[PDB]
Structures are given as structure tokens and as C-alpha cells.
Symmetry: D2
């Protein structure tokens, strides 16, 4: 019975804000609804396929990537609440014109789960919001803040149903989109991740390339030393989907470094940080295996980072393995 | 520009049918649309959670399972085209009253992907249609036909978009649901699976319980003897989603036997057979590792069977491993 | 619980049809849903405004007129059930190519209520279906049959809700469109108009031009000789809306001849005949004031005719006035 | 490209408001969307019919009336921006609990056009917002302010498309609901009514009861003294629909007093005032024929008032007739 629109406004009136943060969130909600509608009928609109370009990270751009990116950018520019935007689909940070400038910096992944688009598997949108720290003219440097500085982070999941998960200092909340009235409804308040799960999520196709710690951990999940039942495996292939399941079911999600991705594949600014923030606000952990994801100070808007996140006891067990091998 | 309604009718007029098959298909389409709408807003309608009962196979029944099951059953009974119905949610076969009896037997899985319902991961509906073979009164025995006898089989996938995949003697076709007008639109005609893929799909959590063949194959996917790049791994956890990806991307999907499921987990009548039929009509293969899934003559409407399906070259490679170990 | 798709098919299986009539009806339903979706968001799609052309009758063509006309024509041509099409938006009858020819002739008004489009008042689509009578090549002459020869007639009403009213030899039935699942649901079966109503519908702006009979009748509705309460007046301005209200509430609808429209304004083939058929099948009457609308043999596909329709007692009272003045 | 959500917020940030007005408007938008969705499928949900009660004005309450009333009331109470609510469906004013109290007073007509519900003709929702004037505890007296004191007024029209018309000191704006994304989009900015129209809207069924002025005016519309073409007549029967057409097409709408309704039928607080405000902000006029509607100080929350509104030249002509007869 509580809509996201009311939630965000009521939360804004309590925080006594000028109103641009609230409007920033309202804009994202609108963009998310537009993206969801397009996604639920993409094939019919001939939105499946490549766009004909390659982004900095090296991924092949898809048509839905372009549409989603365009929607987010346009809605954020007219929110009059942003000054710098960093997108997975743009080589450089986008500087909003003075006229439409706000004090918020937004890092986003317009469409996450590229490889799953054509097979209709869950995909989504990820975002992280920062407050401008510098006093000088807005630049790409303003998006180079550690995740711990986020004011808000979350993601839209276009799965069997569309969910918008929003995390802020107060905690994590889940809102489901009701397609009939175009409103996100609060369905899970102050979400807390289970202390320990029974599912591990990772692409084992890179087994020959995993470091000794990941290798040992996976072996432990399949052949438990305490003779307990093995963990079940799940790997949707879309970070947003695997992470959301990790949040509501508990367990662990991993994307460590490998031969082709020496520093991990996932991007720090718009993939790792937003999810690390959601995880920590839900009582979970997010580490590269050597340091907290949210403490990393980025030097490249598109830098990558290995990431392990989920239930605290599971992530801690893996961390202990990394520590053990480091003292070896 | 071609709707499923037109497709099915035009296909029926060419086959010169009395019209009950066409109506049977029309009924399924309506049920699928109703299920999709409910699925896209399940959380809001409080449809997440257990129903309070356990089916024959031993699974814990969910609320969406009940809703979907009720929809399919009711729509099939009023289609005046069925005489015997076998559902994953019903202990025994359902015998349609004489008044509403038709000559078709339908085996279905109202909602596949139970464990993925609550985390919003893709789920779906699977069905297989047989023509009554006996001459005596319709009974559970009429659903105990080998998959090779299917007249039609397919599934609805409630993923980022809703897709209805239908297979018949003429081939496999994919129709996407356009939520705005409530019509499934043909988006992929006469689908053919790739001869060889680059993705393997299986729950490796059961590694300690896999037979030597599966174990050897997975090792080969991670450490290719020809030194080629390893296969990527994907396991959504919902048979319908993993199978659909296998169909459009190619590769292999596996659910072999393990300690808890000595004869595999997936059910022959409404999970394995429908997908095996779709796969073979698309030029793919479906085997237990020892025999063709579609050739198995069932003796229990709820019997399980191990299943390996997908691209012919991939499935064949695994089969060769099974043959090698059998002659060992 | 009964969908139009099931209704039409079940009705087709009982009539033992080749299937093209059923498919013809299925095609119209699809076109109606597409038109309804466009109508509910026309302003946003910039569909309000003129197209830049004038039809034979002299009306200024609108953009929605073009869209609706295009949808109906395209869906009817691919139904493989029509041979001649007459549209209010086309100067001449449309002859379907031999390849896609069927034996049905369809006269339709793609979008009725032109003057009400921009103010968001109810509009709709009207249609009448005939069976080809001639043996020679299909031509415009095949649409020149009296309304009494109709096999099916009806209209889609895009009002507060979208309704599809279908009339055939068996009677009149009303189906409401459920936007969520894109299915028309039977809500009013075997509709019968009240014997006498309490509402008269006519544009009194043409008062100076009305014939003595209409003038006397209206005076009687405002100043009842039996001292009963006067009839209420209602004139939406869209024939489909005024006629539908007349059907479900009873009463009378009138569009007599006037100075600018000596033979009435409404068109016989796709406005008057379809509604006259619906009215008579519902137990109502439809007259020009001098003869039954359905008995008129047209000589022009776009000829006009005065029309009075609705509850039998009300229409009869007006007819008696016409008879009285004719014997004067 | 401009959503109502953005419009209202951007308008609120410019007016430097605490945020409850913005939230009040956001709440109404949500209620309007919920009502629209229900309306577009009312028949299917069995929402047509009487509720079993009669309101103070004497109207027979319908089911949709109850649903709409419940939605508006509940959404307004949780907006934390209202203190007194006056509904056409409630005998007395509703006093919001201290906990959820705001400083705004809202008078509304949850569902206008009762007699048109069952025939699917356009219906809507009307509202007027006042700022609490008193300093003492909120009571019914706080809603007894003249229309000139309104801070905001408007209506939702559930016609061929759903439109939300909002009027405030800055002017009148029209937003169309896009059912796909559940957002109202600005389609008509700073609307201004034509100085003179060519349509008169009134129920002429009450002709025997009209005062001499109305009678003379109508005669003038049918038999123009300047020999110009007569005005066309339109009377949908739902105030919201007739008024909206008057706004966008120009012309005049009239509901004068008659035998059964000596002081007019329409209610001052939630029918006449909101529309009079919209009209005047659009450059139109609204009079009882003897005084400006917005200047009337109400003494009963459900009092009625005769109303004449629309294009200034048309309303003025009628006013001159009233003046002429008063000096007679
Ligand atoms: N809707 C909201 N929900 C939560 N926190 C908010 C909201 N609006 C403002 N805030 C907080 O107040 C600060 C200032 O808001 P603003 O003046 O809109 O930039 C933000 O950076 C947030 O920390
Ligand atoms: N719509 C259809 N699409 C494909 N095959 C059909 C269709 N309708 C009928 N058939 C074929 O014709 C047979 C007889 O149809 P029926 O008389 O409806 O039971 C079916 O068992 C199918 O093999
Ligand atoms: N779905 C249907 N509903 C009602 N009457 C039908 C239907 N299908 C066929 N008919 C009747 O049967 C005749 C022949 O149908 P067809 O062979 O499809 O042209 C039609 O002209 C109708 O009179
Ligand atoms: N969203 C808005 N649009 C227009 N005027 C507004 C808005 N919000 C506030 N106002 C104006 O500012 C006043 C105070 O707003 P509030 O503090 O929210 O009660 C209102 O009574 C309006 O006159
Ligand atoms: O195919 P891989 O290497 O497992 O990559 C999967 C990852 O790729 C991404 O699409 C990013 O490119 C993530 O959403 C997902 O976690
Ligand atoms: O958790 P597991 O053992 O991998 O089971 C997954 C399988 O379970 C099912 O939900 C059937 O119960 C399938 O849809 C899916 O393939
Ligand atoms: O404005 P008038 O002359 O009353 O015409 C109204 C008629 O015009 C039409 O739009 C046909 O042109 C009908 O739908 C409607 O009954
Ligand atoms: O049937 P009548 O007397 O013309 O009343 C119509 C009026 O009734 C109302 O429904 C109010 O009861 C208005 O919406 C409309 O203007
Ligand atoms: Zn990418
Ligand atoms: Zn991504
Ligand atoms: Zn991306
Ligand atoms: Zn199950
Ligand atoms: Zn299943
Ligand atoms: Zn199931
Ligand atoms: Zn026209
Ligand atoms: Zn027309
Ligand atoms: Zn027309
Ligand atoms: Zn009322
Ligand atoms: Zn009203
Ligand atoms: Zn009302």
C-alpha cells in the first residue's frame, strides 16, 4: 500500500532536502519503468542485436543498451539534480550543462546482463549516487570517489517481475512494479541478508584460471569438510540477477580475476560499488578478497575489480582462505 | 506482424482439423497470458510463499504454483479438446467430464522453476500434447505414452519478456507476448539449434555425486584437450530458462542423477519429454546418457529421468564418454 | 470466464465452418485491440490532428483515422477470408489479391466519432460482414447488398472501457477488453433492448431544418401529452457511443436529414446497416422514417441514409408520426 | 517528454514548498491511475451496479463510486497533507486524524458521470484544493470557502484516453496517462479556451422547466438572428466530459435550475467550483446566470448551484439575456 513515490517524498520531507535528491530518485523511477516496458517487448520492437560499437571496457554494444542508456541520461539531465554522469556505455564522464546542473554525481549501468539479453534471461539497471565533493567545476574526477561515499545505490531487476531495490543510510528496501498502475510498491522493508546461505554463484568455466583461494573454497562447497550437504550452485549470468538472489536467499556471489580479466571483469563505479553498498546496508559483505570494495579509491571511471559478496559468514570463510594463503 | 492466433488457425485450416486442437492451443495461449500477468506482479498480490501442501514428487507447493495450475486446468477443461490431464501439481491424472471431453491428452508443468520464484528469476510453464491412443474410457494410462508420440509440445517463459515456444511436426517457432495488445507475435521462425555451443549448464553443487561420465565431461569443458577456450557456465536454476537459452544460444543442459535423485530430478512427462521434443524438432538431442528421452515408455505419470540436451555435437561428445565408460 | 476467442471458435465448431469466418472474426478482434491501445495513448503518440486529405463523403481525415484504417485493412487482408473491403476512408472498394482472397465482404468504419477524437470523448470502430453473392470476379458491386443479408455485424467502443459488441443470427453479445491479458470477456449475453426507454438522442442544433415529424416527436419528449416526466436527452456526438447507450439503456437515437445532409449524414454501408442489424437482433428497430434500414438496396458504397433506431415502442411512436403526416 | 511527476516537483521546488502540496498532488495522481485502471476493466471485475445506499444529494450510489471514493480517501489520508475532506459520497466532511493531518482541505467527486457508468460513456474524477484558513481544530467549516480561494483544482477524465487536467494560479495544463509506463505526460501547456465556440451543451429534456433566459438563448443557438450557421449540440451527460470538451473546443455548457432541481443539480464544492476555477484560469467564465460561481460562499458542503460555463463571448451573451429579463 506504500508507493515508491510516496516513500521517496516522505523520506525527503523528513530529511529536509531542497528537493533535487527526491527528484533525482523520481527521475530514475520513471526511467526504470520506461526501460522495463521496452524490455518486456524488446523482441517485438526489434531491440535485440548489436548497435555497431564497442565501449571502453571492450564489450559489444547492444540496441537495448543504447535505448536504456539514452533513457537514463535524458531523464537525469532533466532532473536538474546531477552535474556529472558516468555510464558503462560512455567512454568519458558526461558533464551536465550549467543550466540543468545539480549537485549529484551518478554512476550507472543502463543495462546489466548483456550476454543474457537475447535469451530472455533476467537483466537490469544499476546505479550509485554521490554528492559532489569538489568546489571547482564538475569533472570526471568527481565520480572518482570510494563507494563508502555513496548517498544512495540500487538496481532495477527486469526478471519474472520488475523490482527496484534502493539502499540509503537508513537501509535497503524493495519495491515491485505494478504494471497496471505504473507504481512501484514496497514489498520488502529494511531487508537484511541471511548470516549464512546455501548457494554459491560463480562462472566455473574459468576454473583453470582461478586463484588458489577461490579453488579451495569451491572445493569446500562441493565437498564439505563437516560432511554437511553441499551448497547448491546458481549462476544466472547477469550480475543484477545473481546479486538480487544472493540478497533475498543469502549465499555468495563471486567474480574473481582470471586470465582475460586480471583485475576482475565487473566495473567498480557502476557494478561493484552499487552492489557492495546494497550488500553492506543489508548486513552483508563485499570484498575483492584482499580489501573492502567500498574502500577502493578509483583512478579510472571504468576500472574493474574482483568481487565477492553476500552473506557475512560465507564471505568471511572465503576471506579466511585468502588470508591463509597470503601467510603461506 | 504474424500473431500466434493467426498462426495456429492458419496452421489448423491447412491441416484440415475439426478445430479442437486449434482451440486447445488457443486455450493454452490464454492461460499463458493470464499466468504472465500474475507473474509480473506476484509480489504485490502476495503470491510468493508456500501453499501448505506437498506433491507426489516431494516438492513444497507454492501459491503461484496453485494459481498457475488452476488456470491451466480450468482453461483446458473448457477447451472441449482434452480427456486426460497430468499436472506436476496433481497426484493423479485428471479425467475430464464426458460433457467437456476431447481427444487430446495434456501433460503440463504449470509453473517450472519453483526455487526461483521468490528471487524473481525466470520461471515458466511447460506442456506436451498427445492424441488419445486407447479406445476405452480415458484414464491415467493414456498419458503413459513415449515422448515420440507427442503432437505438440512447448513452453512459456516468463523472463525479461514472455515467450511462447511451440513445437510440432513442422518445426519450432517462438512467439513473444506484446503486453500492450495481449498477442503473441512470431519473432523466430523454424528455429534450429547451433550444431555446437560454448556454454554448459548444470548444478555443479552435486559434483561429489556425479557419475564418471559427467565428471569427465565437465573437466573437459574447463580444461579443453584441444587447448581451446573453456566453455562458459550458466545455470539459471529454472529448467525452462536454461533450456530456452540452450535452444537460442546452443550448448548443453544437464540434470543427471545424484544421491538424492538416483533417476534424475526432472519429471519425464511434463519436463523432460516436452523439452526433448522441442530440442529434436530444432535439430538438437536429448538423452538420459543411455537412451533417447523420447523413446522411454513411462510406467508412472510422475517418474523422473536424467536428461542431457542441447546442441548435437555437445550432447554427442558426452554420449561418447558414457559409451567409453560402459565398455570399460 | 468466457473469452471472445473461445466464444468465436466454439461458435464456429458448432456451425461446422471451413474456418475463414472464425479467422475473420479473430482478425477483427486483434485489430480492435491494437486500435484500442493506440487510442488510450493517442495524444502522447501525437495521433491527434488532420492527415491532410478528404474522403468521398467530404469529411476531413484525421491521423487516428489513418492508423485505424491501416490496421483493419492489413489484418483483414492477412485473414485470408475477405475478397472485397469497403472503408469510410477509401474512395473505392478494396479488392483483395487472389492469393489472399476469401469469400467474405467487409464494410467498415475504422474510427467512428471523428469530431470527438480531440476532446477524448468515446469513439469506436464499426463493421458489417457479408458473404460474396456473385459468382464472377469480386468487385465493388459485391458490397452493394441490403443490410438484411449481413452474416455478422458489430462495433468496438473505446469508451471508459473497451467493448466489442458482436451480432449474428443467434443474437447480440457484449465482450469487454481486459487490458491486462488482452482478451475480450463475455459480460452481456443475448442482449435484448428495453421495449421502451426514457432517453432521446439527437443533435438539436439542426432544429430549423428538421422535418415536421422529428419536430413533433421532440416536442412530445419535452412536453409529454400523458403528463409523464419528460425524456432525458443525451447526445455524445459519436454514433457508436450513442447507439451503444441506446442498446443497453433503451430509448431512441436519431440522425434525420437536414439542409446540409438531405439524405441524412450517416453512411448506409458501414454506419447505418451494422447498427440496424445489431438493433434488430436485440429486438429493436431501425428505420429511415419511411422504410427499414436493412431493406435498402444500396447503389453507392458511400451513400447516406437518415436513421432512427432503438427501443421498438419509441421508434414505432416516431414512425406513427411520419405515417400521420404522410396521410395529411 | 515532461511527466506530471516532474512537472509537480519542479513547480514545487520553484515555489519553495514544505512538500506536502507536492505530495498531495502526487497522491491524487496515484489515485487517478488506480481508478483509471479499474474503470478500463470495470465490467469484468463486476463493478457495474448499485452499492445499496443513497447519498445526501439523493443519488443512488454505484460500486465504482465506492471504489473510487475509497481510493481517493485512503490516498489522501496517507499523503499527510490534508486535514478535512469533502466527498460527494459522504454525508459529512471527513476529519483526518491528527497523526496524518496536513493543512490542505480537499473537496472531491470520486466518480462523476454516474448515469454514464453502465453504458461505458466517459466518466471522471473532480477535485478542488484549499488551504486551511481557520486556526482552530479542523472541521467541516474549513471546506465552506468560496471557489476563489482554491489553490489547485482539476479533474481526471476517463474517456477514449485518460487525461488529468490541473489548474493553479499559473494556469491550466493537460497531462495524458501513458498506460504502458504509468506516467501522465504533458500534452497541452497553458491551455486557453477559445473566445467563442460553436457548440452548446445542455440537457434539453428539461425544456418545459427552463427559465426564460435559457429558453431564449437555446432558441438563438438554433435560429441565429445574424443568419449564421446554428451551433451544434453535444451533451455527453457526464459533467467532466462535457466540460473538458468545452475547454478544448470552446462553446458553452449549461446546467440551469429546473423543477426537480430549483437551485441546479450540480454540487458547488466538488463539481461547480473546481470546473469554474479551471475555466477562469483558461480565460473562460462560470456563472449561475446571476453571480460568479467562484464568489459564492457556501453554507452547506453539499449545496447545489446552477452553472453556465465556457467561452467568454458565449457565456456573456447568455448573461446579457439574464440581465435583459431582470430589467424587464
Ligand atoms: N527523498 C530523500 N530520501 C532520502 N534522503 C533524502 C531525500 N531527499 C534528500 N535526502 C537527504 O538530504 C540530502 C540533501 O537533499 P537535497 O537538498 O535534495 O540535495 C541528500 O543528500 C540526502 O542525504
Ligand atoms: N492448429 C493446428 N496446428 C497444427 N496442426 C493442427 C492444428 N489443428 C489440427 N492439427 C492437426 O490435425 C490433427 C487433427 O486436429 P483436430 O481435428 O482439431 O483434433 C491434429 O492432431 C494435428 O495433427
Ligand atoms: N465462428 C463462427 N461463428 C458463427 N458462425 C460461424 C462461425 N464460423 C462459421 N460460421 C457460419 O458458417 C458459415 C461458413 O463459415 P466459413 O466456412 O468459415 O466461411 C459462415 O458464413 C457463418 O454463417
Ligand atoms: N508542487 C507545487 N506546485 C505548485 N505550487 C506549489 C507546489 N508546492 C507548493 N506550492 C505552493 O506553495 C504553497 C506551500 O506549499 P506547502 O509548503 O507544500 O504546503 C502551496 O500552497 C502552493 O501555493
Ligand atoms: O560470462 P561471464 O564472464 O560469467 O560474465 C558475466 C557478467 O557479465 C556482465 O554482463 C558484465 O559484462 C555481468 O552482468 C555478469 O555478472
Ligand atoms: O536446485 P536443482 O537441484 O539444481 O534443481 C533445479 C531444477 O528444479 C526444477 O525447479 C524442478 O523442480 C527445475 O525447473 C530446475 O531445472
Ligand atoms: O455533428 P453531427 O452532425 O451531430 O454528427 C455526428 C455524427 O458524425 C459522425 O462522426 C459521422 O461523421 C457520427 O459518428 C456521429 O453520429
Ligand atoms: O441527467 P442530467 O439531469 O442531465 O444530469 C447530468 C449530470 O449528472 C451528473 O452525473 C451529476 O449527478 C453530472 O456528471 C452530469 O452533468
Ligand atoms: Zn557491457
Ligand atoms: Zn553490467
Ligand atoms: Zn551494461
Ligand atoms: Zn515442483
Ligand atoms: Zn518444473
Ligand atoms: Zn512445477
Ligand atoms: Zn468521417
Ligand atoms: Zn462513422
Ligand atoms: Zn469514420
Ligand atoms: Zn452522484
Ligand atoms: Zn459528479
Ligand atoms: Zn460522483
Amino acid at each position: 500500500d506504500v508507493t515508491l513515490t510516496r516513500f521517496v517524498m516522505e523520506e525527503g520531507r523528513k530529511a529536509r532536502g531542497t528537493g533535487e535528491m527526491t527528484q533525482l530518485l523520481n527521475s530514475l523511477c520513471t526511467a526504470v519503468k520506461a526501460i522495463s516496458t521496452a524490455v518486456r517487448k524488446a523482441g517485438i520492437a526489434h531491440l535485440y542485436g548489436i548497435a555497431g560499437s564497442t565501449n571502453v571496457t571492450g564489450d559489444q554494444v547492444k540496441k537495448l543498451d543504447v535505448l536504456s542508456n539514452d533513457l537514463v541520461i535524458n531523464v537525469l539531465k532533466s532532473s536538474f539534480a546531477t552535474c556529472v554522469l558516468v555510464s558503462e556505455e560512455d567512454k568519458n564522464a558526461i558533464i551536465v550543462e550549467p543550466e540543468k546542473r545539480g549537485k549529484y554525481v551518478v554512476c550507472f549501468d543502463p543495462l546489466d546482463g548483456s550476454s543474457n539479453i537475447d535469451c530472455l534471461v533476467s537483466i537490469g539497471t544499476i546505479f550509485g549516487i554521490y554528492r559532489k565533493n569538489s568546489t571547482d567545476e564538475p569533472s570526471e574526477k568527481d565520480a572518482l570517489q570510494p563507494g563508502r561515499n555513496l548517498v544512495a545505490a540500487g538496481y532495477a531487476l527486469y526478471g519474472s517481475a520488475t523490482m527496484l531495490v534502493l539502499a540509503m543510510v537508513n537501509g535497503v528496501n524493495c519495491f515491485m512494479l505494478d504494471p497496471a498502475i505504473g507504481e512501484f510498491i514496497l514489498v520488502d522493508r529494511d531487508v537484511k541478508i541471511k548470516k549464512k546461505g546455501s548457494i554459491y554463484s560463480i562462472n566455473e568455466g574459468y576454473a583453470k584460471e582461478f586463484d588458489p583461494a577461490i579453488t579451495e573454497y569451491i572445493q569446500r562447497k562441493k565437498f564439505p569438510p563437516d560432511n554437511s550437504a553441499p551448497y547448491g550452485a546458481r549462476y544466472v549470468g547477469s550480475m543484477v540477477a545473481d546479486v538480487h538472489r544472493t540478497l533475498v536467499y543469502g549465499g555468495i556471489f563471486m567474480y574473481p580475476a582470471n586470465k582475460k580479466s586480471p583485475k576482475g571483469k565487473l566495473r567498480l563505479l557502476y557494478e561493484c560499488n552499487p552492489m557492495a553498498y546494497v550488500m553492506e546496508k543489508a548486513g552483508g559483505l563485499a570484498t575483492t578478497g584482499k580489501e573492502a570494495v567500498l574502500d577502493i579509491v578509483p583512478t579510472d571511471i571504468h576500472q574493474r575489480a574482483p568481487i565477492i559478496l553476500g552473506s557475512p559468514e560465507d564471505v568471511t570463510e572465503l576471506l579466511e582462505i585468502y588470508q591463509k594463503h597470503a601467510a603461506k
